[PDB]
Write a protein that binds this DNA or RNA. Structure first.
Lengths: 136, 67, 386
RNA sequence: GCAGUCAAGCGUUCAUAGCGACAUUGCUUUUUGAUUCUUCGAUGUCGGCUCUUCCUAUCAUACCGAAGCAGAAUUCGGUAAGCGUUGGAUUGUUCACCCACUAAUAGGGAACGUGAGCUGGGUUUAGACCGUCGUGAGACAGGUUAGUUUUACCCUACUGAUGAAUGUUACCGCAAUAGUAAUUGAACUUAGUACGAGAGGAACAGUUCAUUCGGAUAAUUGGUUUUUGCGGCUGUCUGAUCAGGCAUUGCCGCGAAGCUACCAUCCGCUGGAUUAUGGCUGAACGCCUCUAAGUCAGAAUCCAUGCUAGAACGCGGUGAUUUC
RNA sequence: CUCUUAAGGUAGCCAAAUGCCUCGUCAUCUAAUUAGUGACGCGCAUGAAUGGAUUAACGAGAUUCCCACUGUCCCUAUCUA
RNA sequence: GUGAACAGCCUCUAGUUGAUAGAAUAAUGUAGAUAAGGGAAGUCGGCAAAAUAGAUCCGUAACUUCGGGAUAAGGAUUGGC
């Protein structure tokens, strides 16, 4: 899952279809992120591509810095707000939906992550884990 | 394997049962059921809900044998 | 003209006709290929779906992220009282098929299979297998004649067995008869085994063991006449439709001037026979054994039965099989548990599972307790009990 | 529109790796025309939505052959339609053009599939506006705005459901025939390995996961909620209290059971015969040759295994078969 | 400069409900816009009571974008009569 | 009676208790509803539905024919004793 990503990911429930605004958790200047596409699931008629924790999406910026706005960039989902089951059997969810701006290889435009991060994303992306303080 | 406690009610949470809510503070809340979860979202106080461990402790109900 | 967006086929055509099964007891359409070197054993068994529960166990899957870590897999419980053998059946090979040549019964049949042979038992003189019990009459001359016919002929051999429904908590009183194939060398040895086991019982401990992958053969839960949308998964039409939206819009093209077999129409959903394969056994338990629901890690004397019983079924006072996952059929249905036909080697099989905990909390609600002792400790004294 | 023959030339050299002028032979009926056979006592003439099937001139996937193929990427070609071929901005649009994902975003047919299946945005009645034209009434494949979409209970087909008769009734079975389903990708390792001057840069085996699809099931999570189950709230009525009625399921919270969700979980088999192609032995052709006799391996192919139904005029085995 | 008219289209306005060519060109709006807005204008064929340009308020008028809100949709499921 | 109210909701007087019924709870419907996460991606078009909603207090822009816009926008409060 994801190019430049260390490892695989077990499926977790999709919360973030295309068209979706999630907050930004990085210090990049951006404030929100509009998910326009998802790197991953390919195709079904009338099925919107949707994202989960740990997924690498194509995103724009609606509110934030002008030098980030008006151009598509990659992003990584770090919080979901939609309950998902871990194999250990706890359904869990965050208060919000949240992402960080990235490059295609997985590195971060930012240097800090405000708020918590799921260990799924933290494990699948090591550069996120570096800049991540709290995990779950 | 471990048995967690409901933050709201004090009930034991066996595996594969309940929910976990991570807040923006990164404070983790555990719920045995949607009842306690919904009362939490409604922002009710366990000390005032009568079926809760906190209530029964604060009102000195039933325990009477530990302290 | 062409479809304009190439999407895939709704539904599976090899599960047609989506009609009602002929009986609640699904047919075993195949048994494992016989190996005429192993001992003589049954290839399948009969049980009753009791319900479901939750299981903790540690995973032993290297390369997985969650190796040597716990998981919460689900399981179906099938109550499986000992199956009792009442008959012997011989099949010889013909260019038109395997054909039954003769079938031998036991001397004393119970009032459950005798019940199976009737539609009105309260009115009857209960005259069945009387002249057969009288055909025995000194030594079984005609009976050994028939067994010798089976030994001489009979490419394959099948044993007639039935269930101990009275030990089961159902209100049925009428047992389920079934033919089960015997696998092992020497059709002679097979039929001698059967003759030895006439009137006698057979328990799952001899047929199934831990970590064995099995197939489950049952009749799916019925849901009556259903519409195309939930029966086939068709897209709902929009809100703006005159004359329904929960429909298929184009029921075929002009030419061929017919409705095809392959377009989705409405009809029966459920009460189909289904065979679901490669469900691992997680526990083979014994009603003789107190602490069926206990574990090496838990060490609390408790049966698998939840507080308040299995919903719509009852308690488990017999042997049972805890099999991974979800199994066709609803509670109280006769399930036929078959041994796998092919040798699986995948590391999902061959994985010795060791349970860690079993959920025995009430399924008639959001159960918070696993034992009434736990409840009494947590709650304390009540107005009752006092 | 698609495909061939020919071969001047291009391609450092070299006609044919890949292209290919001058010419020429053809297929196609998804273009547009030509025609006017049918239909004017009416075959509902755009497009989209929905669903199924088919074809193949194969976009991807499987297996291969060729290269101006070192690797990687790419190009040409073959057997192959088994499986799949998307989400969106603008436009009524078919078409088109961009963004993005993807293994890939191939083309087409079925009364230019599909209106008693929808819609009705367009076109193409009647109202109205403009511009040009016209003395005018009025005209305009020019623009604009508004503008009733009827009927199935019949036969057939299809999906499901019963059923007389074949001594009666009951149980267990067989199996013809029909159907059939699984799909694709990423990561790790193989391996900074092979290959290469270097830049760069694989693959088979194996492991873990995921995509699309399908079949089930409901332990859990979520939803639903006339359990009108518990509680609470408003107005009014029952003198008050208790307990209740009405408010077209009065409202709110929780809510068992049941139904249910890629919003949840489980599962989705193994062999044989072959295509292409590569080969064996071996003549024709006292050498050579995969081929002519014979033969080996071999594809997502075919047939079985397996799975579904079961012949209501296809079978078998067994039980009991009625006197007061 | 020349031909020519009764006069030769004035002030103003515009790809407008009027612009064929046309999805005109530039900018803005979007990730992406045959839409929208702002500008440009030898304008097939704008134009002054066959009224021109503009306009606060009003509009079950036509239209674009934003916020909020939602089963419109992803993707359907359940309940009642 | 509630309430600003001849609104809606309930009641007294007065009048009706009539409209074919019974049994069941399949699909599809008509009418009413609810839905996790997302939130107009749906559609020609946000069609439909949701959301807002009374009163008190605060606060209120551009533009303007100075009259309006304006309930602009946007916020707080509300029970019983």
């Amino acid at each position: 899952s994801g190019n430049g990503a260390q490892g695989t990911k077990f499926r977790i429930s999709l919360g973030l279809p295309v068209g979706a605004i999630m907050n930004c958790a990085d210090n990049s200047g951006a404030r929100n992120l509009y998910i326009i596409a998802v790197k991953g699931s390919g195709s079904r008629l009338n099925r919107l591509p949707a994202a989960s924790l740990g997924d690498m999406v194509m995103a724009t910026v609606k509110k934030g810095k002008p030098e980030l706005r008006k151009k598509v960039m990659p992003a990584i989902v770090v919080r979901q707000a939609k309950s998902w089951r871990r194999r250990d059997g706890v359904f869990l969810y965050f208060e919000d939906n949240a992402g960080v701006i990235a490059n295609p290889k997985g590195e971060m435009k930012g240097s800090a992550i405000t708020g918590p991060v799921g260990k799924e994303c933290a494990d699948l992306w090591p550069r996120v884990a570096s800049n991540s303080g709290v995990v779950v | 394997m471990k048995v967690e406690i409901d933050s709201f009610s004090g009930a034991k949470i066996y595996p594969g049962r309940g929910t976990l809510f991570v807040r923006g503070d990164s404070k983790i809340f555990r719920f045995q059921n949607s009842k306690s979860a919904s009362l939490f979202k409604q922002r009710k106080n366990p000390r005032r809900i009568a079926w809760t461990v906190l209530f029964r402790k604060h009102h000195k109900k039933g325990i009477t044998e530990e302290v | 003209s062409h479809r304009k967006y190439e999407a895939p086929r709704h539904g599976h055509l090899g599960f047609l006709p989506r009609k009602r099964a002929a009986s609640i007891r699904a047919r075993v359409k195949a048994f494992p290929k016989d190996d005429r070197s192993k001992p003589v054993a049954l290839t399948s068994f009969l049980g009753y779906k009791a319900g479901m529960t939750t299981i903790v166990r540690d995973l032993d899957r290297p390369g997985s992220k969650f190796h040597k870590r716990e998981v919460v897999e689900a399981v179906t419980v099938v109550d499986t009282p000992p199956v009792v053998v009442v008959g012997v059946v011989g099949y010889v090979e013909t260019p038109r098929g395997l054909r039954s040549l003769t079938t031998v019964w036991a001397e004393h049949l119970s009032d459950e299979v005798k019940r199976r042979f009737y539609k009105n038992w309260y009115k009857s003189k209960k005259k069945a297998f009387t002249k057969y019990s009288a055909k025995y009459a000194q030594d079984g001359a005609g009976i050994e004649r028939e067994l010798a016919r089976i030994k001489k002929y009979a490419s394959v051999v099948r044993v007639l067995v039935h269930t101990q429904i009275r030990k089961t908590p159902l209100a049925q009183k009428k047992a389920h008869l079934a033919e089960i194939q015997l696998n092992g060398g020497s059709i002679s040895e097979k039929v001698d085994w059967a003759r030895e086991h006439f009137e006698k019982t057979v328990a799952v401990d001899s047929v199934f063991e831990q970590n064995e992958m099995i197939d489950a053969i049952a009749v799916t839960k019925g849901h009556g006449f259903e519409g195309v949308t939930h029966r086939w998964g068709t897209k709902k039409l929009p809100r703006k439709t005159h004359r329904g939206l929960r429909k298929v819009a184009c029921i075929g093209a002009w030419h061929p001037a017919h409705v095809m077999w392959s377009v989705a129409r409405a009809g029966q959903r459920g009460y189909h026979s289904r065979t679901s394969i490669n469900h691992k056994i997680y526990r083979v338990g014994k009603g003789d054994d107190e602490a069926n629901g206990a574990t090496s890690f838990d060490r609390t004397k408790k049966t698998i039965t939840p507080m308040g019983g299995f919903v719509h079924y009852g308690e488990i006072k017999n042997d049972f099989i805890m099999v991974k996952g979800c199994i066709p059929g609803n509670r109280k249905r006769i399930v036929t548990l078959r041994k796998s036909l092919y040798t699986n080697t995948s590391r999902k099989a061959l994985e010795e599972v060791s349970l860690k905990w079993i959920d025995t909390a009430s399924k008639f609600g959001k159960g918070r307790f696993q034992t009434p002792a736990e409840k009494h400790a947590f709650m304390g004294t009540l107005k009752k009990d006092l």
